[PDB]
Design an enzyme around this catalytic site. Structure first.
Site, PDB file in Angstrom:
ATOM      1  N   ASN A  58      -7.018 -42.386  96.503  1.00 56.48           N
ATOM      2  CA  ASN A  58      -8.342 -42.735  96.114  1.00 56.48           C
ATOM      3  C   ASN A  58      -8.341 -44.262  96.045  1.00 56.48           C
ATOM      4  OD1 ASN A  58     -10.932 -42.435  94.963  1.00 56.48           O
ATOM      5  ND2 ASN A  58     -10.202 -41.329  93.214  1.00 56.48           N
ATOM      6  N   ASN A  63       2.013 -30.281  99.867  1.00 52.67           N
ATOM      7  CA  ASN A  63       2.146 -31.509 100.629  1.00 52.67           C
ATOM      8  C   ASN A  63       3.521 -32.152 100.334  1.00 52.67           C
ATOM      9  OD1 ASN A  63       1.327 -33.890 102.034  1.00 52.67           O
ATOM     10  ND2 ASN A  63      -0.728 -33.467 101.583  1.00 52.67           N
ATOM     11  N   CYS A  80      -3.886 -37.127  98.406  1.00 48.62           N
ATOM     12  CA  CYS A  80      -4.185 -38.299  99.162  1.00 48.62           C
ATOM     13  C   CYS A  80      -4.655 -39.442  98.243  1.00 48.62           C
ATOM     14  CB  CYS A  80      -5.318 -37.912 100.102  1.00 48.62           C
ATOM     15  SG  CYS A  80      -6.785 -37.478  99.191  1.00 48.62           S
ATOM     16  N   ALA A 104      -0.696 -29.460 108.348  1.00 50.76           N
ATOM     17  CA  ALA A 104      -1.554 -30.528 108.763  1.00 50.76           C
ATOM     18  C   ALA A 104      -0.748 -31.796 109.010  1.00 50.76           C
ATOM     19  CB  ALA A 104      -2.658 -30.805 107.730  1.00 50.76           C
ATOM     20  N   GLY A 108      -0.101 -43.156 107.223  1.00 52.59           N
ATOM     21  CA  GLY A 108      -1.337 -43.930 106.955  1.00 52.59           C
ATOM     22  C   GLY A 108      -2.578 -43.216 107.474  1.00 52.59           C
ATOM     23  N   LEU A 109      -2.538 -41.909 107.597  1.00 53.57           N
ATOM     24  CA  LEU A 109      -3.678 -41.160 108.007  1.00 53.57           C
ATOM     25  C   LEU A 109      -4.259 -41.597 109.376  1.00 53.57           C
ATOM     26  CD1 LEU A 109      -5.233 -38.684 106.849  1.00 53.57           C
ATOM     27  CD2 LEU A 109      -6.305 -40.368 105.231  1.00 53.57           C
ATOM     28  N   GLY A 111       5.897 -27.828 108.987  1.00 53.97           N
ATOM     29  CA  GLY A 111       5.723 -29.262 109.222  1.00 53.97           C
ATOM     30  C   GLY A 111       6.948 -29.823 109.955  1.00 53.97           C
ATOM     31  N   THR A 112       7.879 -30.385 109.169  1.00 53.53           N
ATOM     32  CA  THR A 112       9.058 -31.054 109.679  1.00 53.53           C
ATOM     33  C   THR A 112       9.762 -30.228 110.761  1.00 53.53           C
ATOM     34  OG1 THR A 112       9.365 -32.263 107.579  1.00 53.53           O
ATOM     35  CG2 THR A 112      11.267 -32.030 109.020  1.00 53.53           C
ATOM     36  N   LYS A 138      -5.337 -32.279 112.304  1.00 55.20           N
ATOM     37  CA  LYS A 138      -4.951 -33.416 111.529  1.00 55.20           C
ATOM     38  C   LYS A 138      -6.030 -33.811 110.522  1.00 55.20           C
ATOM     39  CE  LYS A 138      -3.054 -37.281 110.095  1.00 55.20           C
ATOM     40  NZ  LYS A 138      -1.775 -37.560 109.215  1.00 55.20           N
TER      41      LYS A 138
HETATM   42  C1  LIG Z   1       4.262 -36.714 110.258  1.00 54.60           C
HETATM   43  C2  LIG Z   1       3.537 -35.984 109.140  1.00 54.60           C
HETATM   44  C3  LIG Z   1       2.177 -36.089 109.042  1.00 54.60           C
HETATM   45  C4  LIG Z   1       1.534 -35.432 107.941  1.00 54.60           C
HETATM   46  N1  LIG Z   1       0.169 -35.557 107.830  1.00 54.60           N
HETATM   47  C5  LIG Z   1      -0.450 -34.745 106.928  1.00 54.60           C
HETATM   48  C6  LIG Z   1      -1.929 -34.691 106.895  1.00 54.60           C
HETATM   49  O1  LIG Z   1      -2.542 -35.460 107.700  1.00 54.60           O
HETATM   50  N2  LIG Z   1      -2.537 -33.940 105.955  1.00 54.60           N
HETATM   51  C7  LIG Z   1      -1.787 -33.184 105.093  1.00 54.60           C
HETATM   52  O2  LIG Z   1      -2.387 -32.321 104.383  1.00 54.60           O
HETATM   53  N3  LIG Z   1      -0.449 -33.131 105.126  1.00 54.60           N
HETATM   54  C8  LIG Z   1       0.263 -33.891 105.993  1.00 54.60           C
HETATM   55  N4  LIG Z   1       1.599 -33.854 106.055  1.00 54.60           N
HETATM   56  C9  LIG Z   1       2.305 -32.955 105.144  1.00 54.60           C
HETATM   57  C10 LIG Z   1       2.671 -31.655 105.797  1.00 54.60           C
HETATM   58  O3  LIG Z   1       1.459 -31.000 106.059  1.00 54.60           O
HETATM   59  C11 LIG Z   1       3.482 -30.867 104.872  1.00 54.60           C
HETATM   60  O4  LIG Z   1       2.694 -30.572 103.695  1.00 54.60           O
HETATM   61  C12 LIG Z   1       4.813 -31.504 104.414  1.00 54.60           C
HETATM   62  O5  LIG Z   1       5.407 -32.136 105.555  1.00 54.60           O
HETATM   63  C13 LIG Z   1       5.769 -30.396 103.877  1.00 54.60           C
HETATM   64  O6  LIG Z   1       6.147 -29.366 104.806  1.00 54.60           O
HETATM   65  P1  LIG Z   1       7.521 -29.399 105.634  1.00 54.60           P
HETATM   66  O7  LIG Z   1       8.619 -29.398 104.612  1.00 54.60           O
HETATM   67  O8  LIG Z   1       7.404 -28.217 106.572  1.00 54.60           O
HETATM   68  O9  LIG Z   1       7.499 -30.731 106.400  1.00 54.60           O
HETATM   69  C14 LIG Z   1       2.275 -34.541 107.074  1.00 54.60           C
HETATM   70  C15 LIG Z   1       3.645 -34.404 107.247  1.00 54.60           C
HETATM   71  C16 LIG Z   1       4.282 -35.129 108.271  1.00 54.60           C
HETATM   72  C17 LIG Z   1       5.803 -35.018 108.434  1.00 54.60           C
HETATM   73  O1  LIG Z   2      -2.697 -43.561 103.778  1.00 54.25           O
HETATM   74  C1  LIG Z   2      -1.741 -43.253 103.004  1.00 54.25           C
HETATM   75  O2  LIG Z   2      -1.071 -44.159 102.375  1.00 54.25           O
HETATM   76  C2  LIG Z   2      -1.509 -41.937 102.645  1.00 54.25           C
HETATM   77  C3  LIG Z   2      -0.452 -41.697 101.782  1.00 54.25           C
HETATM   78  C4  LIG Z   2      -0.144 -40.423 101.361  1.00 54.25           C
HETATM   79  C5  LIG Z   2      -0.964 -39.373 101.869  1.00 54.25           C
HETATM   80  C6  LIG Z   2      -2.059 -39.620 102.747  1.00 54.25           C
HETATM   81  C7  LIG Z   2      -2.776 -38.579 103.259  1.00 54.25           C
HETATM   82  C8  LIG Z   2      -2.292 -38.042 104.651  1.00 54.25           C
HETATM   83  C9  LIG Z   2      -0.938 -37.572 104.615  1.00 54.25           C
HETATM   84  C10 LIG Z   2       0.042 -38.278 105.245  1.00 54.25           C
HETATM   85  C11 LIG Z   2      -0.144 -39.572 105.991  1.00 54.25           C
HETATM   86  O3  LIG Z   2      -0.968 -39.675 106.898  1.00 54.25           O
HETATM   87  O4  LIG Z   2       0.625 -40.473 105.572  1.00 54.25           O
HETATM   88  N1  LIG Z   2       1.354 -37.890 105.138  1.00 54.25           N
HETATM   89  C12 LIG Z   2       1.766 -36.777 104.404  1.00 54.25           C
HETATM   90  O5  LIG Z   2       2.950 -36.430 104.315  1.00 54.25           O
HETATM   91  N2  LIG Z   2       0.733 -36.026 103.830  1.00 54.25           N
HETATM   92  C13 LIG Z   2      -0.605 -36.415 103.861  1.00 54.25           C
HETATM   93  O6  LIG Z   2      -1.476 -35.747 103.293  1.00 54.25           O
HETATM   94  C14 LIG Z   2      -2.343 -40.905 103.181  1.00 54.25           C
END
Ligand SMILES: Cc1cc2nc3c(=O)[nH]c(=O)nc-3n(C[C@H](O)[C@H](O)[C@H](O)COP(=O)(O)O)c2cc1C
Ligand SMILES: O=C(O)c1cccc(CCc2c(C(=O)O)[nH]c(=O)[nH]c2=O)c1
Ligand SMILES: Cc1cc2nc3c(=O)[nH]c(=O)nc-3n(C[C@H](O)[C@H](O)[C@H](O)COP(=O)(O)O)c2cc1C
Ligand SMILES: O=C(O)c1cccc(CCc2c(C(=O)O)[nH]c(=O)[nH]c2=O)c1
Lengths: 313, 313
Positions: free
Chosen positions: A133, A195, A131, A20, A71-72, A272-273, A44
């Protein structure tokens, strides 16, 4: 030799999907992920209202992984619900919809409206508990009472099988406590571990500066940095939640990394990355690489090795 | 040159030292660290009584770092106390003694004995808040009420300036709570961030097996995996604890890595995994490399850049 899986009453060509947040924010992104050779996609993490997210730069990548404080940013629940209800071609692959409300009430409101669509189209919910709260309180999944409340309320409001996206833990006591909370909720059918590794700090030596602007440079880590942490969590939950599925996420760059996730217990494997950096072509490579390891070992299916990591003596 | 510095009423030739646990268990190891070019040394964390530790293999290293579940093997407090009182040559460099009792009472008993030695010889105390897993409760530094108890009781029993070895945190509210605990204790004059990243899991793909025998392969991570985690904790505590020093530990392989620790706020810089892998020659190389980066940037002192990491906007 096959990569096929059947879970949660869906069929999957292979275990790979985006994580995600990556390549899943816009309709263009979700069309791209659908066109790719991944076995599923996830949208997302969304909120009730659209969000711009944090100021840039808010993501940066490096040889050993990435840091983000996005920042979501997202197009808002109504957009992802319409995607799931009207746009997604379910004949191509299954769809997961990730929600990440800023309060339990916001999550309840979204899940209530997701449910009829989940029932009629088969979209699957991934609830992000890793995330925020209340500022000054820990993220939800690091606050066990909060986590229980979120899951009680979402279980009642949704009433259908769902899964949860978990942060990594570092203390066995937290594995024990977290898994026990999750096991209170029979509708939690899958657990995605993990995450990002929260609030790391990357500094550039030349500039003597942090590399992202929000939070004085602190953000979540992904990539090579986190694979062993990811594997530990997949395995910890696999052992502790025998009546649930575990999906693995973290540090997957290769078929070998995916194989290690699967030995740890992963059913689905999210990327992800590495996907952010390489693009959706990664899926054909990961498929080929995983099938090559299976061929060399004589494994014909994923279930012949899933969760079969060996321990010593 | 030169990288000489004064802290805690001691003079140090340079900011480098071993990380507790590495090259510091036996008299041989301590004399080897003393003979090295490090600025200081710390002993292996000790219990009242000797411990064999866990079954082997209990340490493994890889290109990206290490995993360990040593099990607090040590020669016992009387041995390290005798080393500090009788055998260490304080003309070479300062000595820190790490203490890791399994209860408050055991730490209190050791620190009451250490105090006169600290007064007479100037040995320094690092109190390790990490411990073997006890089912049903988290490690002490992840239980803020237990941590507060430990520091109240050690502060009272010891009565002299000391430091504390912290595990990493991953949540800004946890940084805020932990730093507030530490700031309750004026005798806590240094904070060492960080201990290994807990309960990771390394799996060998060929063997389909975990790589260490204890804890079904789960152990603490060090090295390249944990640099950004370590930097974030160093900086978080440097910002929150203005009346204390911060010692950086985690992911140091090069003078550049040391430079990043110092920019984040580190006074001393500890070396674990890379020391274990390369041996004590690493100290000459780290010094040369740090001084080379200083010279290229125009810095004549560590104070010119300690804590001066830049943020964006
Ligand atoms: C740019 C970015 C955006 C992310 N946004 C979310 C998200 O919206 N919701 C969430 O569950 N995880 C989010 N993550 C976390 C990834 O889903 C994942 O859990 C984390 O990057 C670890 O996997 P990786 O080592 O393959 O990157 C985000 C990661 C990245 C790099
Ligand atoms: O709004 C944020 O400060 C914030 C911080 C940490 C996590 C989240 C939720 C969305 C998310 C994000 C993000 O949108 O910053 N990044 C991640 O690596 N994982 C995630 O689950 C939001
Ligand atoms: C083999 C080994 C033994 C360790 N034993 C101790 C210990 O006795 N006390 C302690 O405070 N930390 C101990 N640690 C943690 C290190 O001091 C250090 O915090 C960690 O390895 C992170 O630093 P690094 O990335 O340089 O390895 C040990 C680490 C290893 C690898
Ligand atoms: O006995 C253990 O499982 C254990 C676990 C975590 C911490 C400790 C304390 C000693 C220690 C050890 C150890 O001796 O295993 N390894 C580390 O990386 N850090 C440490 O602080 C012991």
């Amino acid at each position: 030799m096959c990569l096929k899986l059947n879970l949660l009453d869906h069929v999957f060509a292979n275990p790979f999907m985006n994580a995600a947040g990556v390549l899943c924010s816009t309709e263009e992104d979700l069309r791209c992920m659908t066109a790719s050779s991944s076995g599923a996609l996830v949208s997302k993490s969304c909120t009730s209202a659209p969000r711009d997210g944090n100021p840039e730069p808010r993501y940066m990548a490096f040889p050993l992984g990435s840091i983000n404080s996005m920042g979501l940013p997202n197009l808002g629940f109504d957009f992802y619900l319409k995607y799931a209800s009207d746009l997604h071609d379910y004949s191509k692959k299954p769809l997961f919809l990730s929600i990440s409300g800023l309060s339990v009430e916001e999550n309840v409101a979204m899940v209530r409206r997701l449910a009829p669509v989940a029932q009629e189209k088969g979209v699957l919910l991934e609830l992000n508990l890793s995330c925020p709260n209340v500022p000054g309180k820990p993220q939800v999944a690091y606050d066990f009472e909060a986590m229980r409340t979120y899951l009680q309320q979402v279980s009642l409001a949704y009433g259908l099988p769902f899964g949860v996206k978990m942060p990594p833990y570092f203390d066995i006591a937290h594995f024990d406590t977290a898994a026990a909370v999750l096991n209170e909720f029979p509708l939690v059918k899958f657990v995605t571990c993990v995450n990002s590794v929260g609030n790391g700090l990357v500094i550039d030596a030349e500039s003597e500066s942090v590399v992202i602007k929000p939070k004085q440079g602190f953000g979540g880590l992904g990539g090579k940095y986190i694979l062993p942490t990811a594997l530990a969590n997949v395995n910890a939950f696999y052992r502790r939640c025998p009546d649930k599925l575990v999906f693995g996420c973290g540090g997957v760059y290769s078929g070998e990394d995916a194989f290690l996730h699967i030995l740890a217990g992963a059913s689905m494997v999210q990327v992800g990355t590495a996907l952010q950096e390489e693009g959706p072509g990664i899926f054909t490579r990961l498929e080929d690489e995983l099938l090559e390891i299976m061929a060399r070992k004589g494994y014909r299916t994923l279930e012949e090795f899933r969760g079969r990591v060996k321990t010593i003596e």
